[PDB]
Ligand binder design. Structure first.
Ligand SMILES: [Mg+2]
Ligand SMILES: [Mg+2]
Ligand SMILES: [Mg+2]
Ligand SMILES: [Mg+2]
Ligand SMILES: [Mg+2]
Ligand SMILES: [Mg+2]
Ligand SMILES: [Mg+2]
Ligand SMILES: [Mg+2]
Ligand SMILES: [Mg+2]
Ligand SMILES: [Mg+2]
Ligand SMILES: [Mg+2]
Ligand SMILES: [Mg+2]
Ligand SMILES: [Mg+2]
Ligand SMILES: [Mg+2]
Ligand SMILES: [Mg+2]
Ligand SMILES: [Mg+2]
Ligand SMILES: [Mg+2]
Ligand SMILES: [Mg+2]
Ligand SMILES: [Mg+2]
Ligand SMILES: [Mg+2]
Ligand SMILES: [Mg+2]
Ligand SMILES: [Mg+2]
Ligand SMILES: [Mg+2]
Ligand SMILES: [Mg+2]
Ligand SMILES: [Mg+2]
Ligand SMILES: [Mg+2]
Ligand SMILES: [Mg+2]
Ligand SMILES: [Mg+2]
Ligand SMILES: [Mg+2]
Ligand SMILES: [Mg+2]
Ligand SMILES: [Mg+2]
Ligand SMILES: [Mg+2]
Ligand SMILES: [Mg+2]
Ligand SMILES: [Mg+2]
Ligand SMILES: [Zn+2]
Lengths: 105, 159, 53, 187
RNA sequence: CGAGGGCGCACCACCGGCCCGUCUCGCCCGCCGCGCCGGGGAGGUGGAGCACGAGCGCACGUGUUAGGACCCGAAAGAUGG
RNA sequence: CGACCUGGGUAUAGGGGCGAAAGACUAAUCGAACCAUCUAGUAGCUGGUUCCCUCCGAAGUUUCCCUCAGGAUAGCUGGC
RNA sequence: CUCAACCUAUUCUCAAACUUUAAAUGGGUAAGAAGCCCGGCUCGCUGGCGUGGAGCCGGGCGUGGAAUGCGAGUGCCUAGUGGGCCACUUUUGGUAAGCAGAACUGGCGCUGCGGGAUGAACCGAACGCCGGGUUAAGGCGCCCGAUGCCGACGCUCAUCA
RNA sequence: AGUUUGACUGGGGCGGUACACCUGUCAAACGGUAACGCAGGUGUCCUAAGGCGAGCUCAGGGAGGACAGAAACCUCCCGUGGAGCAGAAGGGCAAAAGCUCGCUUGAUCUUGAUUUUCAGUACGAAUACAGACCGUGAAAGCGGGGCCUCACGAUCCUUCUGACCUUUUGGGUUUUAAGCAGGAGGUGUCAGAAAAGUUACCACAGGGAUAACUGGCUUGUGGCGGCCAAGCGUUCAUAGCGACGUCGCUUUUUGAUCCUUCGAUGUCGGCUCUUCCUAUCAUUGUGAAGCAGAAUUCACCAAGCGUUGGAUUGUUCACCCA
RNA sequence: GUCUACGGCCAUACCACCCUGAACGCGCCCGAUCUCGUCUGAUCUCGGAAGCUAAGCAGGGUCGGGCCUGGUUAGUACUUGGAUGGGAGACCGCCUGGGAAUACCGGGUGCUGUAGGCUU
C-alpha cells in the first residue's frame, strides 16, 4: 500500500480536524526495568534453565502497519496510533499512480 | 462442513424476480411504518445495506423502532427447542406491510360498526366466523334432459 | 471438575496435612491445669494481688 | 393402554408443615378445620402459608407493616402476617396497630404495645374473626434474600447483573478478563 | 348470594428517581488557605448497587471439590542400605 | 601341554562393576540386582461395588477443549 | 455445378453445481378488553401549519369476535448421558455390502406380551394380581387351540411342483 | 540429566487437511443438515481500487474512411448489458455499483444497542442509530473504508500514544517504577503447550471401539455358463466356434467391509487319513459331427471306481522326465 | 377529445414499419453579447422567434414479434398420508387428499394521481 506523508484528520487535543504528519511507528527498545522484564530476569537467574515458553512457531508473514500521526499545530504536538490492515509492502509518500500512462517497455 | 457465511445458500433467495431488476420503485420508500405494525421481511438483493439474515426471509414481525432508513423488528426465531424474539434492524427496502393485520383491522371495524348498528335496529346478528358448514339440502332439476352416461375408455398405447 | 455455578475454591490440602493435625481433646485438662496453677500462685503470694502488678 | 404422560401426575406442594413443632401443628389443626368448614378463602390462604417453609415465610418489618396499614380504608383492620414481625429501628413514630403474627420480636412487641397497639396469636385471631373479616393479609419480601442476587442468568453472559460467587471481594477477584474491554472482552 | 366499585400483600413487566466510575455540554456558588483550590447541574453510559433491611448461629440432606478419597491394580521415579 | 582345568585367599558394587563383546554376567532376578522406605505413588483404562416395595424416568445430540476410550457446556431427567 | 462455413425457419436428445413457468408436503404471522372509539394534556424530538410522532390523563363501548382439546405460570438444586443401532420413505459415496455417511418419523437400546417355526428392530399390541366376555395381527389336515362348512368359481402335474 | 516428539484418519504409517475461514451444490422449494462428497477459493490487494459530485456508456457486430492489411486510428448505426466492478464463485448494478474527470481523507474521535457463529459466550465480520469534527455537492443528501457474501487472533509480557490524571508505603521535591484508556509485536493444531528419533532388547494399562488368519455380507476382479447372431468354418450363422452387445451363476482368486474373537480359536507348506461336491479326465450306457475305419470333438444319464512314480524348488503354484 | 409539468404502478406501456395530427402546448429551429462549457455553440449553458410538423411526441394501423390474460395440454406429470397390494427386481396399480408446465388455440395492447392549458 501507499499512504501520503500528511493527512488532515481529527486531533483529540484540539477537538477538530488538523493536519498531521504521518510516519511509521517502530517498536521501541525494551526497558530492562519494566516489571515483567524484572520478574523474568529474577526467574531465569539460577538453575532450572528456561522458565517461560519460547514461541518459535511463527505463521504470520506480515504485520499490521501502525501510522504515527502528529498534529502539526505548534501548540499541540499530540500524537496518535492508527492501525491499517496487513500488507506485505508498505510505502510512505510514494509516487502517485497515473491512469492514462504507458507501461514502461 | 458447511461454511458459516452470512449469504450462503441465498443464490435464489436474494436474487431478483425475472425481468424485475433495476431501479427500486419509490412507493417502497414512501410506505409509512409506525411502532406496533406487522411487517413481512422479504429481503431484496438490489440493496445490500441493512439486509436481513437469511433466517428472517419469509418471517413476519412487529415494528418497535423507527430510524431514518430502517426499522427495528421483533421477530420470532426458533433455535432448537426454544423460540425467542430477536430484534433486528432492517432497511425499509426489505420489508412490507403484512396484509393479515390489515384484514383483521377491517373485520374489527366492521364488527364494531355492525354491533353498534344492530343494537339500534333491535335484532341480533352473528359476528363470529364459523367453519364451512355441511351443505344444505337442495333439489337438482334434470330439466327433461337425461343425465349423460359415462363409460371408462379402452386402453390405447399413445406413443 | 467444575459443576454449574459455584465458587472457585482453593483448599490448602496439598501438603500432607494429616501428619500435622492438632486435636484439642486436652483443652478441658489444660483449663483445669491453668486454673489450678492460678490458685496455687494466689496462695503462694498470700496477701499480694492475685493478678499481679 | 392409554396415551397419557405421567410425569406431571403428582403435584409438588406442601400438604402439611415439615416442622414437628406441636404448637404450629395445633394451630394447623385449627385452621384446617376453619378452611374446611367455612367458605372463606382467607382461611385457605392462611393454612397454606402455615404449611410453608421459613424462606417462604420471610420476616415482615415494622416499617413495611406500618406503610401497608396506612393505606386508605385500612383503618381499624387487623394486620395478619404468617411469620415473624421484626422491629425496624429506622422508624420513629409507631401508630396504634392491631396485629396478628406467628412470632414477634421482643423489641417490636414492646414498641407496638407502648404505642397502644394489640398483639394476637392465630388462635386469638380465629376467635376474633373466624372468617378473616376486617384483616389485611401482609407478607414480608419473598425475594429479599441474598440468594436471589446470584439467581438468574449467569454472570458471564451479556446483560446479566447477577452476583458471582467469590470467596473475597477485591481488585484481584474476578475483575480482569471478561469484565473490561482492556482485558479481552467485557460483555 | 350479589352486578358493580375501592384499598391493594408478595411477585412480575415497564417508566421514572438516587449512589459510585467514566464521557459530552454548560453556567453558577464557597473561602482565616483566592488556589494548577473546593462544591454544584444537565444528558448518555459502566457497577456483583439504593429505593423502610434478613441476617447470624446450630442441625440435617443433596451436589461439587482438596485430601489414600468407593475398593483393588501398573510399566515407572527418588532416598538410604 | 595349553590364550589348559581347578580349590582356597583376595580386589572391583548398581547408572556402578566386570565383559576374547552375547547387552553377556553381577546369589534360579539384568536393556540397570536385591532390600526397606517415600507409598495406600498416578491411572481419561480394566474388574467389582452388599436389603425390600412404591413413584418419576433418560442420553448417545449442540458448542469449546493437544479434544477423538475423557471433560466443560446446552439439551433430555428427577426432587423441592 | 459441388462441398464447407455463415444466416434463417424447423427437428432429435439433456443438466446436482442451468432456467421463463412451477406444485404437493412445508415455514412465519393474525384471528381483540394490553382491543375499538371519543375528548384532553406533555415534549428540549419533528416542523409552513391547530404539523407529525410518541408518551400521559379521563370517558364510553362485552354478541368475550373461528373449530377442537386441555388447568396454567414461575423459580431453585440436580443425576445419568455425551460409543448408538434398526425400519418405511427421501438421499450421497461405492459394482455392491448385514458397507460408509445424512434428512424425517417411529422403534430397539430401556420392553414383556400375541403372531412371523426360530430371531434386539417386522405385524398386532405395550404390562399392577385375578374371573367372565370379545377382538387385533395371524390362523383353523395332524403336531397344535380353531373349517369334522355336504364353503363358491376357476387355474395348475413338476423324473429339482 | 530431565523431558517432549500434535490431531483427524474406512487399522496405523506414508499421502492429504476434510484442523480457522469463503462460493456453488449435496440439501429432499423456511432455516439447519454428514462423509478423506463434488467444483473451487483464502492468509492478500488498494491514497485509491476509499468518500462525494458531475458527465458519459460497456462487450460484440455491421457499414464506411490515405498509407492501414484479419487486428493501428476516425465516423455512423444496432447493441438488456451478452462488458466491467482487484481475486474464487454466487448474487447485484446502466444518465449504475462500470468509465473519465474535479475536490478530498467518514480508512478520523466517542458511548451504547443489535445481527451473524452461538452456549444465544468470546473473537472476527456486519447492520441501524446517537454525540463530535469534517469531506463533497447548488441542494436533497451521501460518506465513519472497499457493491454484498472471506481476507483473521485471548490471558501474561513487551512497545507506543493520552489525561498540567492516580499511586510510588512518615512528609516534601525530582528521576524511576506501577496504574487507567486505546493501538501494535501471536499464537495457521487459527478459543491460542515451549518440543526430534529409535527399539526385533523392550515394558505396562487396555482395546475385538482397531489391523494381520477363519467365518459372515458383497462379487468389482477371478472362474464357469446362457441369449442375439455380424462373421469363421472350400460353400454353409448355429458340426464345432462366436464380434458388437446383453442376462446370470460360483465362492477353489483377489479385493471391499470390520460383525465375532486381542484375561490368545497356535499363523505357510508337506506328510498321514477320512469323507463330501461335480462344473466328468478315464471307465459303464447313450445322442451329434466337417463320425468311412482308426483317432478325435461336442452333449446327456452319471461321482460307483480310479486319477500314479520322479528331477529342481520351503513352496502352494510352476516346469520337465516317465 | 386531448396535451404540458411533476409523478404511482413499471411492456396491456416494449420493438419494427406505415398513416393522421385542428388548437394551445411540447419540440425541431435561429444566434453566441453576456453566463457557461467544448478539438468542434454538435452536446452543455445562455439570448431568441423567421420557418416547420419532416423528426421527436400523441392517436390509429399490422391474419406483426413480444408482453398480459384465458382455454387446452389435463385431473395428465408430480405429490401428503395407507396397506402382510403386485412384481425376482426395475418399478407399477389402488385407497385418501392436493394438483402443474410446454407445444397448440383464443382475447387484450396502458390504467391513473396532483397542478395548469387548448378544444364553440
Ligand atoms: Mg459498504
Ligand atoms: Mg493474666
Ligand atoms: Mg412411566
Ligand atoms: Mg427503571
Ligand atoms: Mg452445586
Ligand atoms: Mg485406593
Ligand atoms: Mg520422571
Ligand atoms: Mg543386539
Ligand atoms: Mg499401587
Ligand atoms: Mg489448546
Ligand atoms: Mg470401555
Ligand atoms: Mg448406516
Ligand atoms: Mg447401553
Ligand atoms: Mg422410552
Ligand atoms: Mg417392546
Ligand atoms: Mg412371539
Ligand atoms: Mg420364517
Ligand atoms: Mg381373558
Ligand atoms: Mg400355525
Ligand atoms: Mg385341533
Ligand atoms: Mg423352478
Ligand atoms: Mg426441506
Ligand atoms: Mg433449506
Ligand atoms: Mg453519476
Ligand atoms: Mg454521525
Ligand atoms: Mg481449536
Ligand atoms: Mg469389531
Ligand atoms: Mg466377471
Ligand atoms: Mg462364410
Ligand atoms: Mg488355547
Ligand atoms: Mg483349538
Ligand atoms: Mg452333470
Ligand atoms: Mg401478436
Ligand atoms: Mg393420488
Ligand atoms: Zn492538535
Amino acid at each position: 500500500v501507499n499512504v501520503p506523508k500528511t493527512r488532515r484528520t481529527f486531533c483529540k487535543k484540539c477537538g477538530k480536524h488538523q493536519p498531521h504528519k504521518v510516519t511509521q511507528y517502530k517498536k521501541g527498545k525494551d526497558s530492562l526495568y519494566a516489571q515483567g522484564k524484572r520478574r523474568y530476569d529474577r526467574k531465569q537467574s539460577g538453575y532450572g534453565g528456561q522458565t517461560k515458553p519460547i514461541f518459535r512457531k511463527k505463521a504470520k508473514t506480515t504485520k499490521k502497519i501502525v501510522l504515527r500521526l502528529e498534529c502539526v499545530e505548534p501548540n499541540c504536538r499530540s500524537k496518535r496510533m492508527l492501525a491499517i490492515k496487513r500488507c506485505k509492502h508498505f510505502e510512505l509518500g510514494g509516487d502517485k499512480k497515473r491512469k492514462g500512462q504507458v507501461i514502461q517497455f | 462442513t458447511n461454511t458459516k457465511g452470512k449469504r450462503r445458500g441465498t443464490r435464489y433467495m436474494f436474487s431478483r424476480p425475472f425481468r424485475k431488476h433495476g431501479v427500486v420503485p419509490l412507493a417502497t420508500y414512501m410506505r409509512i411504518y409506525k411502532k406496533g405494525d406487522i411487517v413481512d421481511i422479504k429481503g431484496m438483493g438490489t440493496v445490500q445495506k441493512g439486509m436481513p439474515h437469511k433466517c428472517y426471509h419469509g418471517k413476519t414481525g412487529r415494528v418497535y423502532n423507527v430510524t431514518q432508513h430502517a426499522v427495528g423488528i421483533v421477530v420470532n426465531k426458533q433455535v432448537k427447542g426454544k423460540i425467542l424474539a430477536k430484534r433486528i434492524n432492517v432497511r425499509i427496502e426489505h420489508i412490507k406491510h403484512s396484509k393479515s393485520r390489515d384484514s383483521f383491522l377491517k373485520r374489527v371495524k366492521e364488527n364494531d360498526q355492525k354491533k353498534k348498528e344492530a343494537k339500534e335496529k333491535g335484532t341480533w346478528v352473528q359476528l363470529k366466523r364459523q367453519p364451512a358448514p355441511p351443505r344444505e339440502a337442495h333439489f337438482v332439476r334434470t330439466n327433461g334432459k337425461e343425465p349423460e352416461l359415462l363409460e371408462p375408455i379402452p386402453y390405447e398405447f399413445m406413443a | 471438575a467444575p459443576s454449574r455455578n459455584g465458587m472457585v475454591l482453593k483448599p490448602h490440602f496439598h501438603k500432607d496435612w494429616q501428619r500435622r493435625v492438632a486435636t484439642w481433646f486436652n483443652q478441658p485438662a489444660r483449663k483445669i491445669r491453668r486454673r489450678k496453677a492460678r490458685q496455687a500462685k494466689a496462695r503462694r503470694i498470700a496477701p499480694r494481688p492475685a493478678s499481679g502488678p | 393402554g392409554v396415551d397419557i404422560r405421567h410425569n406431571k401426575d403428582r403435584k409438588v406442594r406442601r400438604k402439611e408443615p415439615k416442622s414437628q413443632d406441636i404448637y404450629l401443628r395445633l394451630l394447623v389443626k385449627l385452621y384446617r378445620f376453619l378452611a374446611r368448614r367455612t367458605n372463606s378463602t382467607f382461611n385457605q390462604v392462611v393454612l397454606k402459608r402455615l404449611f410453608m417453609s421459613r424462606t417462604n415465610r420471610p420476616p415482615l418489618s415494622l416499617s413495611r407493616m406500618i406503610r401497608k396499614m396506612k393505606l386508605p380504608g385500612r383503618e381499624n383492620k387487623t394486620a395478619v402476617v404468617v411469620g415473624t414481625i421484626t422491629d425496624d429501628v429506622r422508624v420513629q413514630e409507631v401508630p396504634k396497630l392491631k396485629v396478628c403474627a406467628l412470632r414477634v420480636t421482643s423489641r417490636a412487641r414492646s414498641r407496638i404495645l407502648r404505642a397502644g397497639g394489640k398483639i394476637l396469636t392465630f388462635d386469638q385471631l380465629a376467635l376474633d374473626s373466624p372468617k378473616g373479616c376486617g384483616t389485611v393479609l401482609l407478607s414480608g419480601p419473598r425475594k429479599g434474600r441474598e440468594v436471589y442476587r446470584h439467581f438468574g442468568k449467569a454472570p458471564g453472559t451479556p446483560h446479566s447483573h447477577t452476583k458471582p460467587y467469590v470467596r473475597s471481594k477485591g481488585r484481584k477477584f474476578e475483575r480482569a478478563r471478561g469484565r473490561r474491554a482492556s482485558r479481552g472482552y467485557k460483555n
